[PDB]
């Protein structure tokens, strides 16, 4: 049978039911009437459906304990994720992509936010590939940027592409970091390359050099010692009368740069992989999409002929989004 009905904070279910409690299609919107879920239920349980926010915004796919769970795909604003969802929140696997360039992120995600492992391609088309934690490049990873004169100008310290943005550069020229990083930021181990044949092998903190290590300019000579935000504070030769170790720890500086570079490596290997699986999961997600779009044309007509004069919001959030 169907039949609508009233809840206390404003909000309506209009549908199917059985044994008092949601089942078949309906549609059941928000407190105060705000928010709607168009789709199928089972036992008080939404299963395969979707859900429209006044912005217009909206999920379509699996449901369980209330909760968007399984398959599903969002569009949010300008972006838009399709793949996995767990008790609420993206995950495992799935693809957040761009609606209007290629900028996207592919691999594992918890509570919503990319971690585990990835690839971001941002909106100039350079990458990040490793290991991300709570939606920040964290742990090892390789960091490749596009041309110079083609990639996205940003302020230091924020830049992790270019770093430092200084004059040994050309429109032409890339640079790659492969080492450890820190709450999005090159810290750590790390080595840094750039095509004309710039090198830093050491110590970063703050997307800068910070520590010891040893930079190899284009020409072939060197600066090395202890670096601090970015500038050499203290070389490696000794006063004329002096004990120091400068050159015995840049040289061990360098030699954990080029573990963590090996290291880097070994995670992009394994974040291609998980980016593999989470374009299956979109894939899988976008027919997940299509039925609950299925299911939800159902709700609506069972609601108009329970209740004509039921107002379901959902398609006016989108037409006026």
């Not at 703050?206 to 670096?227: A, I, L």
Request: aromatic share 12%; charged share 25%; net charge positive.
């Amino acid at each position: 049978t169907g039949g609508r009905f009233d809840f206390d904070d404003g909000g309506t279910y209009c549908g199917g039911w059985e044994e008092g409690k949601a089942h078949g299609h309906g549609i059941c919107t928000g407190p105060k009437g705000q928010g709607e879920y168009s789709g199928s239920w089972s036992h008080g349980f939404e299963v395969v459906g979707g859900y429209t926010w006044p912005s217009g915004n909206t999920y379509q796919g699996y449901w369980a304990q209330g909760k968007r769970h399984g398959l599903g795909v969002e569009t949010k604003g300008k972006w838009m994720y399709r793949g996995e969802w767990s008790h609420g929140f993206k995950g495992r696997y799935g693809v957040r992509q761009s609606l209007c360039t290629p900028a996207r992120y592919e691999g594992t995600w918890s509570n919503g936010l990319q971690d585990g492992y990835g690839v971001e391609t941002y909106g100039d088309g350079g990458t990040y590939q490793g290991q991300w934690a709570g939606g920040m490049r964290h742990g090892y990873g390789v960091r490749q940027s596009v041309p110079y004169g083609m990639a996205t100008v940003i302020r230091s310290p924020l830049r992790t592409d270019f770093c430092p943005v200084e004059d040994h550069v050309d429109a032409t020229t890339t640079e790659t970091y492969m080492g450890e990083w820190k709450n999005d930021k090159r810290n750590g181990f790390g080595v840094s390359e750039r095509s004309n044949g710039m090198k830093y092998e050491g110590e970063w903190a703050n997307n800068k050099r910070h520590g010891y290590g040893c930079t190899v300019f284009p020409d072939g000579s060197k600066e090395e010692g202890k670096y601090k935000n970015n500038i050499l504070v203290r070389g490696i030769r000794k006063q004329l009368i002096p004990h120091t170790k400068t050159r015995e720890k840049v040289d061990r500086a360098i030699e954990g740069a080029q573990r963590a570079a090996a290291m880097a490596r070994t995670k992009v290997e394994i974040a291609n992989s998980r980016t593999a699986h989470a374009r299956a999961k979109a894939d899988a997600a976008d027919q997940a999409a299509l039925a609950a779009r299925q299911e939800c044309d159902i709700a609506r007509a069972v609601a108009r002929e329970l209740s004509p004069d039921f107002y379901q919001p959902g398609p006016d959030y989108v037409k006026q989004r």
